[PDB]
Amino acid sequence: ADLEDNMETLNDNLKVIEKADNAAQVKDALTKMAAAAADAWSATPPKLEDKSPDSPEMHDFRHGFWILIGQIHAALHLANEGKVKEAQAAAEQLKCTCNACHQKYR
Amino acid sequence: ADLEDNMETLNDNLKVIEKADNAAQVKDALTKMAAAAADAWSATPPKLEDKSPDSPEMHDFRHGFWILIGQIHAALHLANEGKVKEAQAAAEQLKCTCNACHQKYR
Amino acid sequence: ADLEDNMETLNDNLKVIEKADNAAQVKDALTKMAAAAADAWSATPPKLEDKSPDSPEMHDFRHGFWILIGQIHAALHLANEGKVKEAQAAAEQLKCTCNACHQKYR
Amino acid sequence: ADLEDNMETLNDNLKVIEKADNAAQVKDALTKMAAAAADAWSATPPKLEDKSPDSPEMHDFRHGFWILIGQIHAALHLANEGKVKEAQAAAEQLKCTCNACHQKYR
Ligand code: HEC
Numbered sequence: 001a002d003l004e005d006n007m008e009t010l011n012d013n014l015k016v017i018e019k020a021d022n023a024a025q026v027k028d029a030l031t032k033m034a035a036a037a038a039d040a041w042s043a044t045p046p047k048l049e050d051k052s053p054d055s056p057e058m059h060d061f062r063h064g065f066w067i068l069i070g071q072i073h074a075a076l077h078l079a080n081e082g083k084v085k086e087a088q089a090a091a092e093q094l095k096c097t098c099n100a101c102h103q104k105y106r
Numbered sequence: 107a108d109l110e111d112n113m114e115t116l117n118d119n120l121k122v123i124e125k126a127d128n129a130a131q132v133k134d135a136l137t138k139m140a141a142a143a144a145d146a147w148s149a150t151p152p153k154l155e156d157k158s159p160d161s162p163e164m165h166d167f168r169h170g171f172w173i174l175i176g177q178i179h180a181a182l183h184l185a186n187e188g189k190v191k192e193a194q195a196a197a198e199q200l201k202c203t204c205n206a207c208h209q210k211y212r
Numbered sequence: 213a214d215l216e217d218n219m220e221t222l223n224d225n226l227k228v229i230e231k232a233d234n235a236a237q238v239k240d241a242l243t244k245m246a247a248a249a250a251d252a253w254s255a256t257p258p259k260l261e262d263k264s265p266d267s268p269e270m271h272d273f274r275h276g277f278w279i280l281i282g283q284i285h286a287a288l289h290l291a292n293e294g295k296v297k298e299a300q301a302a303a304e305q306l307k308c309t310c311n312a313c314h315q316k317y318r
Numbered sequence: 319a320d321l322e323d324n325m326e327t328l329n330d331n332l333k334v335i336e337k338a339d340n341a342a343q344v345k346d347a348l349t350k351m352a353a354a355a356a357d358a359w360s361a362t363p364p365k366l367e368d369k370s371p372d373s374p375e376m377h378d379f380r381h382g383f384w385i386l387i388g389q390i391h392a393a394l395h396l397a398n399e400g401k402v403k404e405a406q407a408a409a410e411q412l413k414c415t416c417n418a419c420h421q422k423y424r
Pocket residue numbers: 109110113114116117118120151152167168169170171174200201203204205207208211212
């Protein structure tokens with residue numbers, strides 16, 4: 001999917017996680033975030049189009065998704081074992097990763 | 107120093123970094139925040155003084171300073187590279203982690 | 213490429229790095245290793261193939277490539293700074309992470 | 319405690335974890351490792367004695383304990399859950415962090 005749609009998927013499912021009651025909903029929302037992040041890994045953002053696909057900026061772009069994916073993965077571990085509030089607090093910290101990439105590249 | 111002094115250190119040195127002119131000034135303030143974060147790591151915040159030190163809430167509290175310290179290290183690494191403005195942007199992003207802990211435990 | 217071929221790309225490029233004489237060779241090789249690692253991410257290894265894709269085992273498998281990719285990125289960071297010796301030593305240390313996953317899933 | 323005594327604690331408790339047989343054993347050994355890495359953070363290694371305490375080298379040194387403490391804390395999360403196999407696998411991957419710092423600064 002394109003970068004914009006993966007970003008909507010990330011945004012929509014963070015909202016799902018915030019308002020969720022129960023493990024299964026959080027787990028499904030995180031699984032979809034992980035898939036959208038993995039898909040977005042390979043995109044070139046509008047503001048880096050004139051940069052070489054191996055420039056530091058493009059490396060650091062992919063590095064932001066690497067951080068995000070690890071955080072999603074860890075939240076998924078918590079959700080998978082029923083720790084819903086812990087998973088939600090993990091999701092609130094990973095918002096900071098969204099913000100840091102957005103400040104540099106959005 | 108106690109937890110309240112550490113937080114004032116963190117807060118004050120965010121302002122120092124924002125208005126700094128050169129890499130040495132950023133590096134010194136970040137060093138002070140790394141020390142105040144490492145010191146707060148072992149504190150018990152008032153809202154958790156009725157939980158056990160070996161409790162999921164205290165482990166999360168401690169984990170929060172570990173996150174903050176890694177982000178402070180990343181910003182120092184930029185300062186050690188002479189990248190003043192980048193280190194300053196990274197110091198600004200710390201606020202998201204400050205807030206994420208405060209939401210839970212302040 | 214399949215997992216086999218990703219694994220063989222990782223093996224070959226470690227040698228490339230080991231015998232490299234400039235930063236551009238090391239960067240190149242580390243970039244191909246990052247690529248193959250990301251490709252190996254989504255694979256299912258034989259020894260887990262009668263296992264649920266949601267199992268702790270398959271989560272751990274994926275986590276192992278997340279670890280590897282992070283170390284490769286750190287080695288790339290050093291290569292971008294022209295630190296051929298540091299980047300080579302970091303590359304050589306990747307073998308511990310290679311070996312650690314092999315011990316579990318091979 | 320001195321750096322040697324902390325490394326002895328780290329080393330001895332790795333071995334206990336590899337040969338442990340109940341949860342509390344792993345948890346207690348990890349808890350001790352957590353403490354020893356915390357203490358060691360603030361030390362100066364012999365090969366870095368004639369370097370500025372705020373040089374990149376001493377910063378990288380401290381950062382290596384930051385990585386190690388993070389990994390110990392994730393292993394401890396598993397142990398505190400009853401996931402002892404898990405946690406022992408996490409223990410094996412920590413060795414790579416030991417080795418990487420040793421190669422550089424021991
Ligand atoms: C990141 C850089 C920051 C900054 C700038 C601040 N904090 Fe914290 N903080 C935490 C707790 C539990 C408290 C309550 C302390 C108490 O009531 O005793 C605070 C408080 C503060 C303050 C107010 C201090 C006061 O005297 O009332 C300020 C100005 C402040 N902080 C700044 C806990 C945490 C964290 C736990 C993991 C983290 C991380 C931060 N705070 C981060 C920051």
